[PDB]
């Protein structure tokens, strides 16, 4: 809950004196991390899926949720089932704890990071930004690992507006860029 | 484009490009001194660089300096 507490004390008030929230029950809290990693393919190897899963079950102590195809029809094959990826959201504890190993060690274990987007937001206040590639963070033998990975993470905050979304996140050691 | 120590350009441009500086940015500089080097004062200026048949325009940009004025004007016609 490292960031968790930091939020209550440090944060909150910052927003309270910023947007002037009349009630503590208004300060944009952290609404679960998402994670996805759409390994897609599958139809070809079917093993790169479990790899992605395990790769996800790594950064996240919880078991990955192998998703399924929906429309089936597409510019390719894909049918009713047709597994594609594994979301696996985060929950408070494991969430912030993850939100910790992230930005504090994940983003830090860069690739050439020199400024994070400030428009990765949707429009309601929630954010989303795919690392474009698994930063090889605390994985099973960083060197003895599977061929790349890459995944997408969606902030998703109880922010009533993207603007407030900027205050939050950044309210913490969130990298970002100007 | 080696030349040891001593960037060189035909007298023409040297006197034309410098004049353009004061006179101000206007019509290009009709010249064949393509074998010359691009200078910073040339930036933002126009120069009619001949290739074979007729001359051609040039947009002297920042990075486009240490290079030869000629390398920015194809001569041959392929397909």
């Amino acid at each position: 809950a490292k960031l968790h507490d930091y939020y209550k004390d440090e944060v909150v008030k910052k927003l309270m004196t910023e947007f002037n929230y009349n009630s503590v029950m208004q300060v944009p809290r952290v609404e679960k991390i998402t994670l996805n990693m759409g390994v897609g393919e599958a139809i070809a190897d079917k093993k790169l899926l479990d790899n992605a899963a395990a790769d996800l079950a790594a950064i996240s102590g919880q078991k990955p949720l192998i998703t399924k195809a929906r429309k089936s029809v597409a510019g390719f094959k894909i049918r009713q089932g047709y597994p594609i990826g594994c979301k696996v959201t985060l929950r408070g504890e494991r969430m912030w704890e993850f939100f910790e190993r992230l930005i504090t060690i994940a983003v830090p274990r860069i690739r050439d990071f020199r400024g994070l987007s400030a428009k990765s937001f949707d429009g309601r206040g929630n954010y989303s930004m795919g690392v474009r590639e698994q930063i090889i963070f605390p994985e099973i033998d960083y060197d003895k690992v599977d061929r790349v990975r890459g995944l997408d993470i969606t902030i998703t905050t109880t922010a009533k507006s993207d603007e407030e979304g900027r205050a939050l996140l950044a309210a913490f050691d969130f990298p970002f860029r100007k | 484009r080696s030349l040891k120590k001593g960037p060189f350009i035909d007298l023409h441009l040297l006197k034309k490009v410098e004049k353009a500086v004061e006179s101000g940015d206007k019509k290009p500089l009709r010249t064949w001194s393509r074998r010359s080097t691009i200078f910073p004062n040339m930036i933002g200026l126009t120069i009619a660089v001949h290739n074979g048949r007729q001359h051609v325009p040039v947009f002297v940009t920042d990075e486009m300096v240490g290079h030869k004025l000629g390398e920015f004007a194809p001569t041959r016609t392929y397909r």
Partner: protein, 114 residues
């Protein structure tokens, strides 16, 4: 050890092996041993901790791996998005070093396109 580009060029010789670093070669590899105080006949694998430690440390200076294979495109890219004979050559896949395109260019451009 990862050394730099994560590469594990071991079970050989400090020099020849270290050359595995996308950014170093016969010269840089045999020279880094100087500031790193390392021999040549030394097997990178057998290398004691500090031995490899110094390596990574000294190589941390000269640009290597990613940044190189990466930035190396910046320069080429420039000419390309610049409009000079240099870049112009790359897009057409033709020899930039001014070679004979009439014949012998299998390396620069594609092999056979009959």
């Amino acid at each position: 050890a990862r050394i730099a580009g994560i590469n594990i060029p071991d079970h050989k010789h400090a020099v020849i092996a270290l050359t595995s670093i996308y950014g170093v070669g016969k010269t840089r590899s045999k020279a880094i041993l100087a500031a790193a105080g390392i021999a040549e006949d030394v097997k990178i694998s057998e290398l004691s901790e500090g031995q490899i430690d110094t390596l990574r440390d000294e190589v941390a200076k000269f640009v290597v791996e990613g940044d190189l294979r990466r930035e190396i495109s910046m320069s080429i890219k420039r000419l390309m998005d610049l409009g000079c004979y240099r870049g112009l050559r790359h897009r057409r896949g033709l020899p930039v070093r001014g070679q004979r395109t009439k014949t012998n260019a299998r390396t620069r451009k594609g092999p056979r396109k009959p």
